[PDB]
Scaffold this motif. Structure first.
Motif, mmCIF file in Angstrom:
data_model
loop_
_atom_site.group_PDB
_atom_site.id
_atom_site.type_symbol
_atom_site.label_atom_id
_atom_site.label_comp_id
_atom_site.label_asym_id
_atom_site.label_seq_id
_atom_site.Cartn_x
_atom_site.Cartn_y
_atom_site.Cartn_z
ATOM 1 N N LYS A 66 0.780 -1.236 0.000
ATOM 2 C CA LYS A 66 0.000 0.000 0.000
ATOM 3 C C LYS A 66 0.821 1.301 0.000
ATOM 4 O O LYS A 66 0.342 2.329 -0.472
ATOM 5 N N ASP A 84 -6.909 2.048 -5.897
ATOM 6 C CA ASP A 84 -7.404 2.775 -4.731
ATOM 7 C C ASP A 84 -6.526 3.974 -4.372
ATOM 8 O O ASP A 84 -6.805 4.688 -3.409
ATOM 9 N N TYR A 138 -10.432 -0.298 0.614
ATOM 10 C CA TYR A 138 -10.250 0.323 -0.700
ATOM 11 C C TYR A 138 -11.357 1.369 -0.852
ATOM 12 O O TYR A 138 -12.196 1.273 -1.750
#
Length: 201
Positions: free
Chosen positions: A50, A73, A110
């Protein structure tokens, strides 16, 4: 980073080794392995999947390997020149099978992808962001549905849930800082081309 010829951001976890080895096969003299590298050489950063987009977007790392699910995302503008093929998974709408009522609340890690998907479909539903074990939001009734990543479906099945719809497919992707591409073309252009020859589904 200024002290390294190239700084590579890799995702720790299931995709790490394949990412490391393909980049090596592509001509990058990666150092042995969270920050590795010698002055003027190729450096390596072991990051959370991420966080990879942030380091690359800000230019700290010129290139990185990150899952498409994360990029979908990310509210950042990243150049994605290569689909590396591994790290296969999918983002799906998941719900308790017995729960067919209207979707008013969706739990997910997300939030941006989910909000965008809802809007594309002209739907208004609250999006609640959770950190982990997203399936529990559906089981406990915290939300009417969830949007999460699925591989084999073992977790969602064990929790008594079902995939109502597959929203997007994902695999590891190579992202490159656009500024770095122009200023380090001699190294990055051939690297990108080579990685493509070394990648498949």
């Amino acid at each position: 980073m200024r002290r390294f010829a190239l700084t590579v951001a890799l995702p720790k976890g299931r995709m790490f080794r394949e990412a490391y080895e393909v980049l090596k096969r592509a001509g990058l003299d990666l150092p042995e392995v969270l920050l590795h590298g010698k002055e003027g050489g190729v450096a390596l950063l072991e990051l959370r999947n991420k966080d990879v987009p942030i380091y690359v977007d800000l230019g700290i790392a010129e290139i990185g390997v990150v899952g498409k699910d994360v990029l979908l995302d990310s509210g950042r503008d990243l150049f994605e020149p290569v689909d590396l093929g591994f790290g296969a998974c999918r983002l799906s709408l998941i719900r308790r099978p017995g729960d067919t009522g209207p979707i008013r609340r969706v739990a997910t890690k997300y939030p941006n992808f989910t909000a965008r998907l809802l809007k594309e479909r002209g739907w208004a539903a609250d999006v609640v962001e959770l950190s982990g074990n997203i399936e529990l939001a559906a089981v406990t009734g915290l939300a009417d549905a969830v949007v999460d990543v699925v591989q084999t479906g073992a977790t969602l099945r064990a929790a008594g849930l079902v995939e109502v719809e597959v929203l997007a497919h994902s695999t590891a992707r190579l992202v490159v800082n656009r500024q770095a591409l122009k200023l380090k073309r001699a190294v990055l252009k051939p690297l990108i081309q080579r990685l493509r020859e070394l990648s498949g589904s």
